[PDB]
Amino acid sequence: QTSAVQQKLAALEKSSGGRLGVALIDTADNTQVLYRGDERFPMCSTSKVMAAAAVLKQSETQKQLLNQPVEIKPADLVNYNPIAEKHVNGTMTLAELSAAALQYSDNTAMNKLIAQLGGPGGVTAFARAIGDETFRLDRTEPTLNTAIPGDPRDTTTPRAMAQTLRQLTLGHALGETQRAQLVTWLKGNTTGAASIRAGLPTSWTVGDKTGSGDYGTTNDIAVIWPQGRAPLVLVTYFTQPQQNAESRRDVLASAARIIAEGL
Numbered sequence: 001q002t003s004a005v006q007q008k009l010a011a012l013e014k015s016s017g018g019r020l021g022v023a024l025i026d027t028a029d030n031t032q033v034l035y036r037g038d039e040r041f042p043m044c045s046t047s048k049v050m051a052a053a054a055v056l057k058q059s060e061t062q063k064q065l066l067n068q069p070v071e072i073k074p075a076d077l078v079n080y081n082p083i084a085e086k087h088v089n090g091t092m093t094l095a096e097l098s099a100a101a102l103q104y105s106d107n108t109a110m111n112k113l114i115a116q117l118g119g120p121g122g123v124t125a126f127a128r129a130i131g132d133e134t135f136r137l138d139r140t141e142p143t144l145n146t147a148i149p150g151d152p153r154d155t156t157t158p159r160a161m162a163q164t165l166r167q168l169t170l171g172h173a174l175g176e177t178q179r180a181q182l183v184t185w186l187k188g189n190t191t192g193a194a195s196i197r198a199g200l201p202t203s204w205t206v207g208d209k210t211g212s213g214d215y216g217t218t219n220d221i222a223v224i225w226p227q228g229r230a231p232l233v234l235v236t237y238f239t240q241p242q243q244n245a246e247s248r249r250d251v252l253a254s255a256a257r258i259i260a261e262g263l
């Protein structure tokens with residue numbers, strides 16, 4: 001049934017010069033649209049959702065964990081740290097680090113989440129525990145964004161990430177309070193208005209996490225609450241052949257618009 005939407009996505013991809021991956025889940029009826037749904041893409045900062053969620057899972061057995069202070073030192077600053085740099089020689093709580101990672105895409109904050117989980121493999125272990133056999137986190141910030149074509153490190157597929165995002169935000173992979181906290185954080189994202197959201201009707205409510213990296217990699221993963229129907233989960237991943245390619249958030253908006261016009 002989805003051949004027409006898939007053909008429109010293929011035409012968009014052809015004009016973009018890059019490689020596009022899309023996965024939709026409509027949670028009213030679990031129907032789906034996939035485009036390169038089982039191909040691997042570099043996650044870049046979209047991986048911050050899995051790290052924050054893994055810390056939320058830890059907080060289910062430690063009521064005070066999100067209030068736990070974490071030291072920020074000058075040597076911890078990496079390549080984009082708009083929140084963490086204000087706290088150097090001080091501390092941020094795990095809640096503050098989660099909010100900074102998710103809503104501002106702070107890369108130092110992501111590294112503190114990764115360290116709280118015991119390294120990149122602790123994020124992967126959480127993914128496995130919630131049923132995601134595809135996600136892999138191999139490196140910290142900033143090197144997880146190298147996005148080299150053919151490199152499996154720090155990748156997932158659109159199908160797997162859409163299913164995981166659904167289970168984290170609308171399903172029961174997290175406890176109820178933790179799920180609500182993750183949704184609140186995503187809905188408060190500051191970085192998403194040019195990506196999936198730009199392709200959807202302005203009245204719809206969106207929570208999302210963007211990512212970008214080398215090879216012009218431009219990504220967005222979103223939960224969408226349209227008016228008058230059950231929520232959708234949409235992943236759009238895009239990567240290009242040249243290491244220094246520019247970001248193409250407009251391609252993600254165009255993919256989202258094709259999806260919305262097919263509903």
Ligand SMILES: Nc1c(-c2nnn[nH]2)cnn1-c1ccc(Cl)cc1Cl
Nearest residue numbers: 045079080105107191210211212213
């Ligand atoms: N561009 C991004 C993202 C990002 N998140 N979502 N989409 N992109 C996260 N970190 N950075 C980044 C990296 C290096 C420099 Cl110098 C500046 C920035 Cl802002």
Ligand SMILES: Nc1c(-c2nnn[nH]2)cnn1-c1ccc(Cl)cc1Cl
Nearest residue numbers: 001002005031032033259260262263
């Ligand atoms: N995926 C499906 C089915 C379907 N029926 N049985 N299994 N799947 C029917 N409609 N769609 C669909 C959903 C979203 C968009 Cl945008 C476009 C389409 Cl054509």
